[PDB]
RNA sequence: GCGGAGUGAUCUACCCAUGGCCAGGGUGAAGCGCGGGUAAGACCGCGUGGAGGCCCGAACCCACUUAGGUUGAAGACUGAG
RNA sequence: GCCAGGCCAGUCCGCCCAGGGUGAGUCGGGACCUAAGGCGAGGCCGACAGGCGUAGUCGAUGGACAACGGGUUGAUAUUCCCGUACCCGUGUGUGGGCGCCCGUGACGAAUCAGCGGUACUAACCACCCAAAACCGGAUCGAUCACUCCCCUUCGGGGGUGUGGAGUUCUGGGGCUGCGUGGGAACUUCGCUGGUAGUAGUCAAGCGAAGGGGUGACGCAGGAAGGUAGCCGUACCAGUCAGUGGUAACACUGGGGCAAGCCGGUAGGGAGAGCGAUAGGCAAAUCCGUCGCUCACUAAUCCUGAGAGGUGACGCAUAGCCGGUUGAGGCGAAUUCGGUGAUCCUCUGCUGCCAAGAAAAGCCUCUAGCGAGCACACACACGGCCCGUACCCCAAACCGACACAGGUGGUCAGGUAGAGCAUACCAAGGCGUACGAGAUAACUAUGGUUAAGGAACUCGGCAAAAUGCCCCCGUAACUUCGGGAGAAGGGGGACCGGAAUAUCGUGAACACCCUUGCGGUGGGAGCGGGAUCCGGUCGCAGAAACCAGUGAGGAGCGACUGUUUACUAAAAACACAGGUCCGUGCGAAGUCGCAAGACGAUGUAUACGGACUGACGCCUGCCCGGUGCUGGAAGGUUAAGAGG
RNA sequence: AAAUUCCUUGUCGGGUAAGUUCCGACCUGCACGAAUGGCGUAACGACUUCUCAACUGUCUCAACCAUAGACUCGGCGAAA
RNA sequence: UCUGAUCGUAUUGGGCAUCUAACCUCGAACCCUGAAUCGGGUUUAGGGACAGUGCCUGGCGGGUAGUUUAACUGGGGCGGU
RNA sequence: CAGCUUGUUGGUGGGGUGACGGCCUACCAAGGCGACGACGGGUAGCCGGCCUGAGAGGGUGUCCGGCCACACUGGGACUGA
RNA sequence: ACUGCAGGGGAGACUGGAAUUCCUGGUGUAGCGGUGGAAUGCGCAGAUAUCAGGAGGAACACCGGUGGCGAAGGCGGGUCUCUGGGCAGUAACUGACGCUGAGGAGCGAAAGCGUGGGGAGCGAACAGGAUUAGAUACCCUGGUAGUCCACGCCGUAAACGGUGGGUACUAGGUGUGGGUUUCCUUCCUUGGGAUCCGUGCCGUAGCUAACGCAUUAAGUACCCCGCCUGGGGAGUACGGCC
RNA sequence: CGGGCCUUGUACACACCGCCCGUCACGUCAUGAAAGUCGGUAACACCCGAAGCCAGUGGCCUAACCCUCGGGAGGGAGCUGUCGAAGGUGGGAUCGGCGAUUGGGACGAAGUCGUAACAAGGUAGCCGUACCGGAAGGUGCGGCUGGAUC
RNA sequence: CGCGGGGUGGAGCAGCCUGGUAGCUCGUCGGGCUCAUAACCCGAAGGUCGUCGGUUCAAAUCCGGCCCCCGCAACCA
RNA sequence: AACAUG
């Protein structure tokens, strides 16, 4: 579902786009929309804390239900599959039988009109949300919460999933999408399946301005700066940087995780 | 030139929110039709459509060449491109 | 007014002096609303100073919200005046209505009373578990008692039958207890006469706390329908411009008028009832969801440019008289076409991905309030605050100057033209502040040049050249799009004929009709576009102005793009694509002493760093040096302990 | 023999009447080299470089014309 | 009384495991609260003597700061002294 | 050598020739040819015959006889049966 | 067409056990590994061995053969779902509807290519060790692409039976795969006979230069297609197509 | 180490002291590529166009016929146009020659360096394909017997 | 020209600031092995330590002079 | 292990 353009212009030579074949109803649901504004990388002090940000198209926030705690047994119906500019997945509008509208991340294979269950008595179908205690092992899940009642945090980009390895007593072993083996509580909730829109990694954005539309502002290498600007700056022709490679703030490469962070008791294995 | 305490982003650099502007001419992407061709197709020829950091060109934004200016009309500009 | 100032003079002036002059329910703002951002009660944080921030409160460049045409002054006018509207509020009448107090209109249970569900499960029964002990076949080894038999150093085995304490398979009790499972009282509910058509609820209006709907949003591209504007013309009022012609349609002027209201056209838009309702912080008749029935093909309803009506028995106007040529008075005709927007229908329609503010306001629901309300006509009233003069592509603003510079938006007519380019002109403005002369060199800005044609020079620098429209025709290479307007050619004016339906645009008179802002033919008048043949003219028909030079070979960077404001626009930077490294979530990273923030309302197909820079084919060897990652056997080593 | 080659105008071929620049090779790489990427590449460039047609006051070699100055008169009137 | 082993008593210290009450939580709910994604309180779910922080102590540290880097010399540099 | 063809393929009315005919012209139709080799390229005057061969074939076109083409190269008409 | 029958024919989804490797924990102590002989290497920081748990990938012991199926390439763990062909009998139906097929089209082992996954073991390249005059090899220790999957491209093989398809005929003997039918049918014996379709071995006539083929022809014949014309140069250059 | 017999493989037969492969160096012959350069041939488009035919025009010239004796009729020259050879300009097509430098090919004698094939050729060999290497060749993956000698 | 390395048997390298011995590898020579040659095996030989001239009882070694070879420098207008 | 050549 990746349409390739034809090379009519130099900016559309290798370019490609989504086919958008999964989407019904091009407009969002008006009560579930909150406004956003840009920042350009600036914090509350007004200074750039994240470089290469700004420009970008105007956006509105779609309220996603990352909790799904309060409808255990009330079934829902997938009404539409909509575009969300705020993320790489598509979103599914749910019509619960009691009368409430919600958005969730659309799993792989949750076409329009499907019924979605929730709670400890749900079926293992793509889109149902259960506690991890009720999911069997080996099941591909997504949108998993770290603490109980805290909201979905893990594996929720497009195409990503967690494999549930095993449950021993009070803890489930998860394989996160990086190869990380993490141990979390079994009262944590997770949605069955795999996040859809899995072909968007193959999109070739064709031109510089197409990434300026998405909010990515240009990026100057440190080796073509001056030594007052970067530790790699300097030289009379072009260099490699006359030192082992560092950040713009002089920090070397290497492990930046806190070596005695509190969650080391929960990590079985680091990523590969 | 060194320090202490302050003042400045009405210029300029970038970002944020909300507005406005872009004469005219050309080329003719996707798609959708219709005809063909096939067991079905790919594919093929017409239409239609109006894409694009597309083309030509004013306003507008620039500043490549050149001449003039150089106790200037102007502490950075004019003319022709 | 004229002694300063204005690049000269000045009787003039943006200069000097005195007086005067700026009128709003509707225009632009506040008294209405929020965005980015600001401030910020309490608060959290920080030795102090202070940092951030919640409620809240400000903040238009945006949202909502009521006015048009004419006349008037020396100076203001959507503000004054005249005509005609619209919006919010207030009082007083008059008029019926709708309610409270009254009735009424439906709805409407709470006393008590007979069994099932078959609760309760005592119990009996289904099931089978070591199916509490136990009898008993049987299991097994180096225990062990009596007795028959053999050897010896006199301590113990083999042939092991019977049997004690028993491992084992189970013949077998298998009652119970241990279980679930149908399964009585106690106790409790579904119904039925019944306290019962009984108390009670609701039945004017207002609700703005709150709920819900709406408000409410991108970009590109039209098409169809109109309209303004413009150009002609019926008709109207005038002209004779001392020249060869021209006495009237030959020429010149006119051929006007808004908001509002009426109207509902073209075009757009929507199925409607009734019931239930885990949701909307309380409630809901509203919203959401679900269900049935009918409607569906339609009709109806809302919407909606324009036409037409009215506003207009008014106002204006060409012109004619009158004129201290300042005032004044009178005042014609106004029809039908063409062409046509950047405006309107249209916040509509189609397509696209990059997925496109909030809040008031408005409508609706209920909580709540509530005995008097709602409404029509008439008359009489209130409608506050600030801005308004003037200049505003400039001599009044920013550049020290009346400075060739800079300054956002709206209006934008004619002939030619594709055009808001260009040339000439209208309406309207201006000749802008030193002049007058004079054929010196020389300098600047334009123009032309015989023969030659890059011989010039670091270099074709500059100049010249090409240039439009329609029709032919077009190479290597290529990523199949391009290259390409490649290259290289031909035609082009005027007059007449084809030519009255030649052709194509719109479509009047009258025929015809389901009676209307209708349809069908019908074809006048008005403009548009080429083509063919014939003729005529010049040196030249793209006519002036305007208006691509082309082709070939290398390097570098793929490309469009950015950059040293003021000597460097590039081969530098950026880029899409690549790879490595970090990061498991108030993540890493950054800003802060911290709190807090950003990253991101994101979650490894994500985010940050580094290097390489579309694409094609590729990217070899070295881990000794130095970093990075992991390890911890050995050596050495801090404070503390020990003393 | 390179945006890299000092020696150096290396040598050979092409282009010119004549070519220290240009294109094609050679390898003797002072001092090339694979993501400070290696070698190619259609399209594109106010980029650098060499050649051709056309075209001309760039030149052989200048000559004339008009305007703004310079120049005379009157007025005002500085500067380093 | 010695080296080696073992054991008792008393004292001191390190591992290892569990606990909950310090402390911790941007996990959840309720109240202050009329309007509150702030804050505080209350209860619950977790974590837990770990972490964080004070004092002391070792490492690393062009990230930042202040500085030094000689003279002679047929100019200085380079060489030599 | 795989797409050739616009008087090209057919019709009508005229013209033309000794004669039929796109032979020419105007108009109308949209055909015609091709893998049974179109359109290109290479070579060649064709034949009665001659040479060879058992024949079938293969090679050849010289004398003589037939027909064709040309007359320095290219183009054109005149006269005349 | 009907009635039966045999089959690793194909595609999709799910799924099973053994072994290899790795990870975690226990026990354990100094070697393991490898070869003709060694060395590199691994280990003493607790390897190899051994037991329990876990993750992951690839191939499917026995059945299994000389056998089956498919046009060829090819095809064997299980189950389910979708699907193609063949054989035999009946003779119900159609009435020569056939055979071959230049061009063309489709399929087509392995290696390789593109994008995206996955990666146990194996293993080009590469690196070290050995051997040797050398050793860019064979042997040993490691080890990247690749081998796997999804979707496309490639279109070649000693793609072979070195044997193009169709048809008819021309002694038998002898195994084996699938049917059908006959006498004592149970003479249990699943035996012999007949017949149809395969797949092997022997063997007559005939053919062949010989080896050999021989009812599955390389025999006797007819129809159609592909190909050959001494060896090199060369399946190369040039042109075109992909 | 040498011999004898039977059997098996062979690319050996003056017979393994056999046969034989590919780089490298030297010589000759023919051939491919190449910046560029020199030719030939047949067309195409446009510009210009002689002769001549045809179509017009014909103010000037003209014996035959007609006449009203003026002339008329008909003709000719000249001129205009369509077509038109040769020439000019342009962009392609196509067939040859030369070309610094470079790719292989064949053959030369007593050259240099290995030993890949033929025997189990000393690691069975060949085929397709990939990567690598002075060179024959090596290794992987699949395949064939045209090998497997116990 | 400066600076600092180097010259050792036929070739390529040690030995030198550690003054008293000149070494390894290939090669050359003689003998094996083989039908013959390579490879292999045994046994030998071969050097003024670039030249000269000092120091020392004594020099490859230490110190000067030359003659060669190699590397790095030779910059600012 | 081992082994080239004429
Ligand atoms: Mg601030
Ligand atoms: Mg970034
Ligand atoms: Mg720089
Ligand atoms: Mg620094
Ligand atoms: Mg640099
Ligand atoms: Mg450099
Ligand atoms: Mg200061
Ligand atoms: Mg400030
Ligand atoms: Mg600013
Ligand atoms: Mg500011
Ligand atoms: Mg356009
Ligand atoms: Mg199309
Ligand atoms: Mg553009
Ligand atoms: Mg404009
Ligand atoms: Mg200048
Ligand atoms: Mg300009
Ligand atoms: Mg004065
Ligand atoms: Mg004055
Ligand atoms: Mg305070
Ligand atoms: Mg604050
Ligand atoms: Mg605020
Ligand atoms: Mg306000
Ligand atoms: Mg505003
Ligand atoms: Mg005024
Ligand atoms: Mg009024
Ligand atoms: Mg919105
Ligand atoms: Mg007159
Ligand atoms: Mg509703
Ligand atoms: Mg009207
Ligand atoms: Mg229109
Ligand atoms: Mg839309
Ligand atoms: Mg005014
Ligand atoms: Mg000023
Ligand atoms: Mg000015
Ligand atoms: Mg501007
Ligand atoms: Mg105009
Ligand atoms: Mg203009
Ligand atoms: Mg002026
Ligand atoms: Mg003059
Ligand atoms: Mg001239
Ligand atoms: Mg001339
Ligand atoms: Mg010329
Ligand atoms: Mg020239
Ligand atoms: Mg010159
Ligand atoms: Mg010169
Ligand atoms: Mg120029
Ligand atoms: Mg010019
Ligand atoms: Mg080009
Ligand atoms: Mg052109
Ligand atoms: Mg004409
Ligand atoms: Mg003329
Ligand atoms: Mg560039
Ligand atoms: Mg451009
Ligand atoms: Mg700039
Ligand atoms: Mg500059
Ligand atoms: Mg510049
Ligand atoms: Mg952080
Ligand atoms: Mg990563
Ligand atoms: Mg890096
Ligand atoms: Mg770069
Ligand atoms: Mg990048
Ligand atoms: Mg190491
Ligand atoms: Mg370390
Ligand atoms: Mg040279
Ligand atoms: Mg060059
Ligand atoms: Mg060159
Ligand atoms: Mg180097
Ligand atoms: Mg590398
Ligand atoms: Mg590199
Ligand atoms: Mg590069
Ligand atoms: Mg550019
Ligand atoms: Mg000169
Ligand atoms: Mg004077
Ligand atoms: Mg450091
Ligand atoms: Mg420093
Ligand atoms: Mg100091
Ligand atoms: Mg000094
Ligand atoms: Mg000196
Ligand atoms: Mg014709
Ligand atoms: Mg005729
Ligand atoms: Mg005819
Ligand atoms: Mg001939
Ligand atoms: Mg014969
Ligand atoms: Mg003859
Ligand atoms: Mg003759
Ligand atoms: Mg002759
Ligand atoms: Mg004749
Ligand atoms: Mg099967
Ligand atoms: Mg296993
Ligand atoms: Mg593993
Ligand atoms: Mg083990
Ligand atoms: Mg299977
Ligand atoms: Mg019949
Ligand atoms: Mg066939
Ligand atoms: Mg074929
Ligand atoms: Mg295929
Ligand atoms: Mg494969
Ligand atoms: Mg692959
Ligand atoms: Mg891959
Ligand atoms: Mg090796
Ligand atoms: Mg190996
Ligand atoms: Mg590859
Ligand atoms: Mg598959
Ligand atoms: Mg095969
Ligand atoms: Mg074959
Ligand atoms: Mg046959
Ligand atoms: Mg058979
Ligand atoms: Mg046989
Ligand atoms: Mg034969
Ligand atoms: Mg041959
Ligand atoms: Mg080939
Ligand atoms: Mg070829
Ligand atoms: Mg014998
Ligand atoms: Mg033999
Ligand atoms: Mg031999
Ligand atoms: Mg040779
Ligand atoms: Mg050639
Ligand atoms: Mg003529
Ligand atoms: Mg040559
Ligand atoms: Mg061999
Ligand atoms: Mg071999
Ligand atoms: Mg060997
Ligand atoms: Mg071999
Ligand atoms: Mg190898
Ligand atoms: Mg191979
Ligand atoms: Mg093999
Ligand atoms: Mg010897």
Swiss-Prot record:
GO cellular component terms?
A: large ribosomal subunit; plasma membrane
Signal peptide positions are none
Query: For bias kind Basic residues, which ranges apply?
Result: 36-58
Which residues does the annotated region (Disordered) include?
A: 26-58, 224-272
Keywords on record: Ribonucleoprotein, Ribosomal protein, RNA-binding, rRNA-binding
One GO molecular-function annotation for this sequence?
RNA binding
Q: Name one Pfam family in it.
A: Ribosomal_L2
Q: What does this protein do?
A: One of the primary rRNA binding proteins. Required for association of the 30S and 50S subunits to form the 70S ribosome, for tRNA binding and peptide bond formation. It has been suggested to have peptidyltransferase activity; this is somewhat controversial. Makes several contacts with the 16S rRNA in the 70S ribosome.
By sequence similarity, the record places it as follows:
Belongs to the universal ribosomal protein uL2 family.
This protein is called Large ribosomal subunit protein uL2
Higher taxonomy: Bacteria, Bacillati, Actinomycetota, Actinomycetes, Mycobacteriales
